[PDB]
Write a protein that binds this ligand. Sequence first.
Ligand SMILES: Nc1ncnc2c1ncn2[C@@H]1O[C@H](COP(=O)(O)OP(N)(=O)O)[C@@H](O)[C@H]1O
Ligand SMILES: Nc1ncnc2c1ncn2[C@@H]1O[C@H](COP(=O)(O)OP(N)(=O)O)[C@@H](O)[C@H]1O
Ligand code: NA
Ligand code: NA
Ligand code: NA
Ligand code: NA
Lengths: 314, 306
Amino acid sequence: EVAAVVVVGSCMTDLVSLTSRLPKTGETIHGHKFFIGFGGKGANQCVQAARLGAMTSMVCKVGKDSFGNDYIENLKQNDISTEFTYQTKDAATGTASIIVNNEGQNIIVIVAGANLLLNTEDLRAAANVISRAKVMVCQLEITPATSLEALTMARRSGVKTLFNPAPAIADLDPQFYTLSDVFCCNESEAEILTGLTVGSAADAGEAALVLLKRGCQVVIITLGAEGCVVLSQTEPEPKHIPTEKVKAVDTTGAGDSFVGALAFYLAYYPNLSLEDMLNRSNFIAAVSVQAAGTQSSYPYKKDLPLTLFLEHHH
Amino acid sequence: VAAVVVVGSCMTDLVSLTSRLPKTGETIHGHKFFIGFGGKGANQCVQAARLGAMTSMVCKVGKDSFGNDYIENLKQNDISTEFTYQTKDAATGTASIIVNNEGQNIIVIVAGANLLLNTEDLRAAANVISRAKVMVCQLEITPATSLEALTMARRSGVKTLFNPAPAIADLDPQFYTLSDVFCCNESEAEILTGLTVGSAADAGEAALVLLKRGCQVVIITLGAEGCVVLSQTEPEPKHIPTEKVKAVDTTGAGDSFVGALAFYLAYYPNLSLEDMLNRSNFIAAVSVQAAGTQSSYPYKKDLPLT
Ligand SMILES: Nc1ncnc2c1ncn2[C@@H]1O[C@H](COP(=O)(O)OP(N)(=O)O)[C@@H](O)[C@H]1O
Ligand SMILES: Nc1ncnc2c1ncn2[C@@H]1O[C@H](COP(=O)(O)OP(N)(=O)O)[C@@H](O)[C@H]1O
Ligand code: NA
Ligand code: NA
Ligand code: NA
Ligand code: NA
């Protein structure tokens, strides 16, 4: 009956306008389509996990506005607990305004808004839900100090920590590394965090080694169509996990699918090998890249192969 | 009974403030976001309503959050929504704006549901239109629809107030002959006439070209310089200046002016035109003294009794 995956992080409303050319300074242009979507890394990861069958709770803060009420309703529609989804008069729900041209190039303006007002007192009220969970998931779209306190609470209670340093900041508090049981980022994030170039999968292996030695138990670097790379303290040699080639329609939010799937497996299938979790997580994320719309492309359990939810005797 | 009927656009304004504007491929973080209720049609309707006009807004929005919220905004300003349609086929119109610290911006408009307001939708409103005093249109909906709205008003003896905004270079000349009052700004007059409009004397000359295309009355708004007016009976340009004020935010001031004018045409038909425009200048100038477009439009109770 209790939540097994707890996500502390961000909800954002995505506001997207499609145009033929991007506008220059001082220009007014007309686009040909507008749409809304439910976004934010925290809520994206939570939604994927829930749709796989996880019992989830989303700890976040939105506005006391239309976007916020709508966000709450979106979480409820996906069977996510909103017990610790706070609303505040003091800021608008977080927004991501995105303008896209015909070649796929874009301009993006994020206003984090209510997400920055999720504070330490707000977490403390959730201590019980956090201590009874199997996994706690965080990112860097809320106040860093809040994510860091979340990771600390989870650790104190023996709860597994899954940390996604996204978007990445150059001079990240090293406590994030030592509080991370599983540290998962993409290629360009690994460039920012380590100062290294990441073109190939071999390069990603070297970057991942630097992050491992800063104190992470497990490091995973996602690589788009190349799948992912994993290292651990017990197995520090890079292990490249490729994925079956697919016609990518839209890769937006695929990383959040991957991480949400990974949370699902860490929580409900703790005995699987790590290599196995990542295969399944690749597969699920790859289903998401085959459809448009971020959260609306994340697959439900009922639409997936049944073997993704089986395990043999160990 | 409604005395002012507006056939036109409702848009949701989505505004993000940043320190610098973003280049191609950039993700940047702004420091504030806000929502506002916009669209020229609704803006003009709202100013007229706040002055005490009984108004009806004929428009189309989406069957979405933004649309429901728009309907509620109109109701909150005592506007009839009898002919505010909602459609599944498109989203409520949007204007996405990104503004830096120096006030420079990038804007992306998606007209959305506004372009689906058609001729059948207007036909149902024929009764409300024929019992009105004034009909107001702009160019943010399908031009053919505005043009039919003007034609219905004319047929029923209803006064037509047309605001060709944003302006198109090759405007159907039927718009000129169906306009009892034709009102635009400086840069719009440049587009419609091909002439330069730096001064108030230039505006007078541009206004004369528009008059000779068949308008009864031509008014050209001029920001801090007020406005210029000509008519078929008095074709010499008359410059109406306005008191200097510390402008906080001029966004939507043209829509305040036009809504005020609709109010006066409908409820004070005996005032001289010069008088209407003085009052309309004053009301619009109150609006420039505050931020927020519609929220800066003054109510009657907050205005001098005259
Ligand atoms: N083209 C593609 N084909 C198959 N799988 C893909 C893919 N692009 C992304 N993926 C999957 O999604 C994961 C995350 O990709 P990533 O590029 O890091 O996230 P993002 N920046 O696209 O939101 C990969 O590890 C992989 O499992
Ligand atoms: N700075 C200002 N001071 C006083 N009145 C002002 C003003 N800027 C605009 N106005 C008034 O509002 C009207 C519309 O200005 P205009 O510049 O055409 O509207 P807009 N394009 O800013 O929305 C003018 O006719 C004038 O009455
Ligand atoms: Na990611
Ligand atoms: Na997708
Ligand atoms: Na205007
Ligand atoms: Na204003």
